[PDB]
């Protein structure tokens, strides 16, 4: 087909990853509607009643809007952050607190329970989940106030508690977390989830209101005691947990519910696949190297750069033209003040020397639109970048040591600005080699 510079190709692939992660588009890509059938990622469901919507997270309204555009919704609620508003046709919108829950969070949860009380065994209920659902959508167990929750969560952090141990305790004092929301669905539950978690563990997203929770009340008590806060937490918390130990209150979801189906519709992997698919259409062989890349940014750039070197030099592990995709979320370790920059900018800049003079390009970007404390989403460099940096008398190693990669990339057209993206499935590095 038509010819394209390696840069147009790279930017084209970046656009594909972002589109595949768009909450609105992601829902439409996953949910297809016939005349009486709803097909979610291949799974077919017959419409034998009404359709309800319960959305929670930063993209609640956008996801809800997609459902309303392809299905008539009897009623529902969308709980999102303050400012994320955006009106809907038949779905009530509520803005709540985040990262700290407030009374609106409770109001949202109560609104959701009301809807589930009305939905019948023959109705379909869409549960739309995105980031921030834990604070935005919450309803404490009996006798427990939002303030009791705050104090408990605070004592957990104050005493240094592992994140999953905190989720265990929180899941056991919430009426909707730990699969409890799914337990309230009388009909068919179709859950659409967007993941901003490396590895995509559903138990963590919004505290898994529709997924199983293997932890128990006993685990929660052990944890509070282990950190000597069992006596420090409010009486209402100890009481609810003791009641759980006595079997007076239901446990968090332990088994699978044949009527509630969880679908992950936007994630780093889904965006990487969108990249590989487009790459193949453009005539490249494409490979997803990983979707769980973690570690120091600078070093990730050296490692990806070393593979690019091997490919351009010996045609292994793959023969060009080829596209390699690395997803995950790297980090920059700063011991001091540091300069201007971020992870993806350091990945890109660090790789410049190893790909110097090669017919290759590396673009590393964060799908949420920002990288480090800057307005750039990441960096984009090619085989000419290193020499352009040297021509301006820039010492790359020194720049990286000072963690001031933004300033270096800024001078050689190496910054990637996406502006607001409306989503977050973490970062992706695309490496392109067009020739040896």
């Amino acid at each position: 087909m038509i010819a394209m510079d390696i840069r147009e190709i790279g930017l084209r692939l970046v656009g594909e990853a972002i589109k595949a992660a768009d909450p609105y588009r992601a829902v439409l890509n996953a949910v297809k509607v016939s005349d009486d059938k709803i097909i979610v990622q291949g799974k077919e469901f017959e419409i034998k009643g009404k359709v309800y919507v319960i959305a929670l997270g930063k993209a609640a309204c956008e996801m809800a809007r997609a459902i309303e555009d392809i299905l008539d919704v009897e009623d529902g609620v969308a709980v999102t952050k303050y400012g994320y508003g955006k009106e809907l046709k038949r779905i009530k919108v509520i803005e709540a607190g985040h990262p700290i829950p407030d009374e609106k969070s409770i109001l949202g949860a109560k609104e959701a329970l009301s809807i589930l009380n009305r939905a019948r065994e023959n109705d379909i209920v869409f549960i739309l989940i995105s980031g921030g659902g834990s604070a935005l959508f919450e309803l404490p167990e009996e006798g427990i106030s939002l303030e009791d929750l705050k104090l408990t969560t605070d004592l957990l952090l104050k005493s240094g508690a592992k994140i999953h141990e905190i989720n265990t305790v929180r899941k056991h004092i919430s009426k909707v977390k730990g699969g409890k929301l799914a337990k309230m669905i009388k009909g068919t539950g179709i859950v659409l989830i967007i993941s901003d978690v490396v590895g995509d563990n559903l138990e963590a997203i919004a505290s898994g209101p529709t997924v199983k929770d293997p932890t128990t009340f006993e685990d929660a008590k052990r944890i509070l005691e282990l950190y000597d806060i069992w006596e420090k937490v409010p009486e209402s918390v100890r009481l609810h947990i003791e009641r759980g130990l006595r079997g007076e209150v239901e446990e968090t979801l332990k088994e699978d519910l044949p009527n509630v189906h969880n679908f992950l519709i936007a994630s780093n992997s889904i965006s990487c696949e969108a990249i590989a698919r487009e790459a193949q259409r453009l005539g490249f062989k494409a490979y997803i190297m990983t979707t769980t890349l973690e570690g120091e940014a600078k070093d990730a750039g050296l490692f990806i750069g070393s593979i690019v070197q091997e490919i351009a030099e010996r045609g292994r592990p793959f023969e060009p033209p080829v596209v390699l995709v690395f997803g995950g979320e790297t980090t920059v370790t700063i011991e001091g003040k540091g300069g201007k920059g971020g992870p993806n900018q350091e990945i890109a800049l660090s790789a410049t020397r190893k790909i110097s003079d090669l017919e290759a390009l590396i673009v590393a970007f964060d799908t949420d639109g920002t990288d480090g404390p800057t307005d750039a989403a990441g960096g984009i460099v090619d085989g000419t970048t290193y020499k352009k940096l040297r021509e301006k008398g820039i010492d790359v190693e020194k720049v990286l040591k000072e963690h001031n990669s933004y300033e270096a990339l800024k001078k050689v057209g190496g910054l990637l600005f996406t502006g607001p993206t409306g989503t977050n499935v973490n970062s992706i590095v695309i490496a392109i080699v067009t020739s040896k």
Side-chain angles (χ1 to χ4, degrees):
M1 207 110 287
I2 69 172
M4 300 179 163
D5 292 318
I6 192 166
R7 180 156 305 226
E8 162 171 15
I9 292 172
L11 293 175
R12 182 176 173 88
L13 297 177
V14 166
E16 284 297 302
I18 297 174
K19 295 176 187 176
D22 178 62
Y24 182 80
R25 294 171 185 272
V27 171
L28 298 188
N29 291 328
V31 188
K32 305 301 179 182
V33 174
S34 289
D35 182 293
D36 195 5
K37 310 295 178 177
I38 296 179
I39 310 177
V40 188
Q41 303 193 318
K43 191 72 174 61
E44 194 181 310
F45 302 84
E46 184 181 7
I47 305 175
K48 51 192 62 182
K50 294 180 179 59
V51 179
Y52 290 100
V53 171
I54 294 176
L56 48 132
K58 296 175 182 175
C61 291
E62 278 295 284
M63 289 172 81
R65 187 166 63 80
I67 294 298
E68 294 193 311
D69 293 331
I70 63 179
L71 293 169
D72 296 305
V73 179
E74 176 56 44
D75 188 45
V77 67
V79 191
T80 190
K81 289 179 59 62
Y82 292 114
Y84 293 52
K86 291 173 293 183
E87 54 183 294
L88 293 172
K89 295 171 183 176
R90 304 209 58 183
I91 301 172
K92 181 186 184 67
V93 175
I94 297 176
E95 306 191 326
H98 178 281
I100 301 179
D102 61 36
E103 292 311 308
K104 293 296 172 61
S105 302
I106 288 185
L107 176 58
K110 287 182 175 296
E111 284 286 56
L113 305 202
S114 170
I115 293 172
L116 292 178
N117 182 59
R118 175 187 173 187
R120 298 296 89 197
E121 296 68 24
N122 68 305
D123 299 323
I124 295 183
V125 180
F126 275 98
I127 304 295
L128 311 182
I129 310 175
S130 50
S134 289
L136 295 170
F137 194 78
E138 178 53 58
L139 183 58
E141 280 294 335
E142 82 300 329
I144 302 174
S145 69
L146 174 50
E147 198 52 53
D148 288 317
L149 170 55
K150 295 184 181 182
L151 300 182
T152 302
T153 51
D154 279 308
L155 296 175
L156 290 173
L157 300 170
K158 267 188 174 181
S159 62
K162 297 189 181 184
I163 173 179
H164 70 75
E165 298 181 304
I166 291 178
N167 295 0
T168 292
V169 176
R170 294 189 304 90
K171 288 182 177 190
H172 287 80
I173 54 177
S174 167
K175 297 186 63 180
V176 293
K177 291 168 167 52
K180 287 178 169 297
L181 188 68
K183 289 181 66 178
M184 300 174 96
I185 299 174
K186 305 178 186 184
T188 296
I190 295 180
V191 185
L192 307 186
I193 309 169
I194 291 179
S195 176
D196 61 354
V197 179
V198 174
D200 301 327
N201 170 34
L202 304 179
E203 277 180 38
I205 301 178
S207 293
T210 70
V211 295
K212 297 190 294 301
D213 166 30
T215 67
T216 61
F217 282 112
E218 188 163 300
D219 290 329
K221 187 176 181 183
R222 291 166 172 169
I223 289 174
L224 290 181
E225 292 180 300
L226 178 63
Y227 291 145
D228 291 299
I229 53 176
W230 172 248
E231 298 293 356
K232 295 184 176 65
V233 300
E235 204 190 316
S236 67
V237 171
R238 275 194 301 291
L239 181 61
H240 176 68
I241 289 174
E242 285 299 315
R243 292 195 65 200
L245 291 178
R246 287 194 281 284
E248 291 169 31
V249 296
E250 301 183 342
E251 178 62 76
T252 45
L253 183 60
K254 294 284 169 293
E255 305 283 296
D256 281 298
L257 296 173
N259 62 305
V260 179
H261 312 272
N262 290 290
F263 301 94
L264 181 56
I265 69 168
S267 67
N268 190 281
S269 176
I270 285 171
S271 284
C272 288
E273 298 175 335
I275 290 173
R277 183 177 295 107
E278 182 54 32
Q280 295 163 319
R281 297 189 56 176
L282 298 169
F284 294 83
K285 281 299 180 62
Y287 302 96
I288 295 172
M289 308 303 281
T290 185
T291 53
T292 59
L293 177 76
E294 292 175 296
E296 197 63 29
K298 169 192 170 65
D299 299 288
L302 288 181
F303 300 133
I304 290 168
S306 71
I307 294 175
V308 167
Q309 280 187 294
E310 198 69 20
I311 291 177
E313 190 70 50
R314 303 155 175 284
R316 66 194 188 188
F318 312 112
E319 290 288 347
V322 61
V323 171
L324 284 59
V325 189
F326 303 85
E329 192 83 325
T330 61
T331 54
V332 181
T333 301
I334 304 178
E335 184 59 56
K337 292 185 180 182
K340 202 180 197 303
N344 288 305
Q345 292 167 68
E346 275 196 27
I347 286 178
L349 182 64
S350 187
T352 58
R353 189 159 195 167
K354 275 178 175 290
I355 69 169
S356 183
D357 293 317
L358 302 179
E359 293 303 313
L361 178 150
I362 287 178
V363 56
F365 63 103
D366 200 313
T367 58
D368 69 20
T370 59
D371 185 56
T374 80
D375 289 307
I380 177 171
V381 297
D382 55 40
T384 74
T385 307
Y386 189 64
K387 288 185 177 178
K388 287 177 182 175
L389 290 165
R390 296 303 292 151
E391 270 302 303
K392 291 202 173 183
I394 294 179
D395 176 32
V396 180
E397 291 61 46
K398 185 184 66 180
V399 178
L400 285 167
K401 177 184 177 183
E402 286 166 37
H403 296 298
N404 195 41
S405 60
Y406 181 96
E407 299 305 311
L409 293 176
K410 181 175 73 183
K411 304 183 179 179
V412 294
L415 289 184
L416 183 67
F417 287 90
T418 58
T421 67
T423 185
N424 177 24
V425 294
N426 288 317
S427 301
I428 302 172
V429 182
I430 302 177
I432 305 170
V433 184
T434 54
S435 180
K436 294 176 60 178

